[PDB]
């Protein structure tokens, strides 16, 4: 009932065995080595798409690089997913999450725009949420160069990218884009860059994760909050879009995704809360290393598909 | 959903046109006319079933009347739904909720056992939850009197019957029955009868509902609380079965269902929280008077089906 999946144990062993630069092996985590290691073992290939296209989105600090993923070359008007990557083991960009965004596009049969928002410390807050909001409003306008007619937005993101989902949804709630946000899907969201990581002894499942693995997740959280800066949404959640919130059972910050789901329910916002029992923080980009993550991701995508179908059915009824 | 649905506004005008609450209560003849009115306008007919069978369940206060609904005359082994009715606009029995339990059995394609648990003031607390637990344990043993073998339980109930779902799921969590409870579906649960009904002032949608309508829901809630009694589930919710929790947008006690869904999420229990925007307390037996309630119920049934499918994949 308290457990670690066997593929999860293997990944945690792989993390503990990662040597350092020939400079000094010891306890070694050069971002360069992490980048090589995670690119190699983490996720499946991007694979085949009808559309895989670089975009340039006009933004308040210059052009925002983005990328369109679509199983189809062309399609009827419908929703578009806008994706905000999180970070941790790697800083994160279009390449780190590209296999996930391609697979999301295939399973939901919808176009996915992934956003390469400005990172800290090069670009202070509020560059990251400004870019995410600019990108959502641009997609919502159905720009000629996108080659898609967009009738609604779905926002998706992982870890601190999850908080970029929450803050962008709240911004478009307060000042709507051309079309509405009809669903949010934050994966294991990190909802407060101000909040200190739990210590080993404060996590009830610490004994299952082990101190050495928990140190990895702590380091990832700290690095992520350094690079991906957004404000906690501590105010009223009334009028936020219907949600799928997914946590990791072995994630020391599972309480952050749980509390967001709980606050949505208390405000009367529909929410599907799921927890990946015996899986870790960061699983959506670990679908090769930890194949049991596929089931976790597919369960989230099925819930999101139900919200989208119901949301479009309720709009066809109202009109 | 547009603050008050047109069909809901029509039902509230219908309610205002009946003889209504006096000194914050429904007296005996007012309630009597309301019950005939609700029987005449509320729900569609029971309709066609492959099985519609009366049952007698042994319980700690005598026999417990129950009724099996099933579209199929005969079926492979599978989950069984146990249903614990609520009340308020109806007294609550096998007849008042029969159309709902029949439609639940058809849509899910599963047997539903509705339970006629002992009521107060004749049988005081804890007869109701005792009967509900006994009935669930009985169904779990796959008794010969059902023509059906049971691999798992699903618990479902409305209003004070929603709290019988919660208390019963907790009892079977602590001391398992022969098969597990794989899902819970409380509709607009009343989770703490000892709490005061919200005032017109305290309910944020009071102005949409109107004072006269609010007095009706308050009187109907008091009438239900007299008949159907269980105490709040007090401890840790960890280990509780995966849930679909449905509230009413115009229901003064929506905070109770919202808070239950929120407490499940905090404990790491998977939960689908849904709120029927612009619909009222008691909609699951108002599918004829308020046809828009069909969409609310089918949405809850679709989410419940996803839980059952995932529960049986995993096993
Ligand atoms: Cl922000």
Numbering used by the authors:
A (entry chain A): 3 to 321
B (entry chain B): 3 to 317
The authors write:
The crystal structure of wild-type EH0 was obtained at 2.01-Å resolution, with the P212121 space group and two crystallography-independent molecules in the asymmetric unit. While E53 and Est8 are monomeric enzymes, and EstA is a tetramer, EH0 is presented as a biological homodimer with approximate dimensions of 6.3 by 4.9 by 2.7 nm, which is assembled in a twofold axis symmetry arrangement that buries 5.6% of its total surface area. EH0 has a long catalytic tunnel with a very narrow entrance (approximately 16.8-Å depth). The structural superimposition of these proteins reveals a high conservation of the corresponding catalytic domains and also a common spatial arrangement of the helices at the cap domains in all the proteins except EH0, where α2 and the long α7 are visibly shifted very close to its EH0 active site and are apparently impeding the entrance of substrates. Thus, withdrawal of the cap domain seems a necessary requirement for allowing access of the bulky substrates to the EH0 catalytic site. A deep inspection of the active site showed that the nucleophilic Ser161 is hydrogen bonded to Glu226 from the nearby α7 and a movement of loop β3-α3, including the oxoanion in the conserved motif 87H-G-G-G90, compared to EH0 homologs. Additionally, at the beginning of α7, Trp218 is within a hydrophobic pocket surrounded by residues Phe13, Ile17, Leu28, and Phe219 from the cap domain and Phe91 from the catalytic domain, which is also anchored by interaction with loop α1-α2 and Pro23. In our study, some flexibility at this region has been found from the two conformations adopted by loop α1-α2 observed in subunits A and B of EH0.
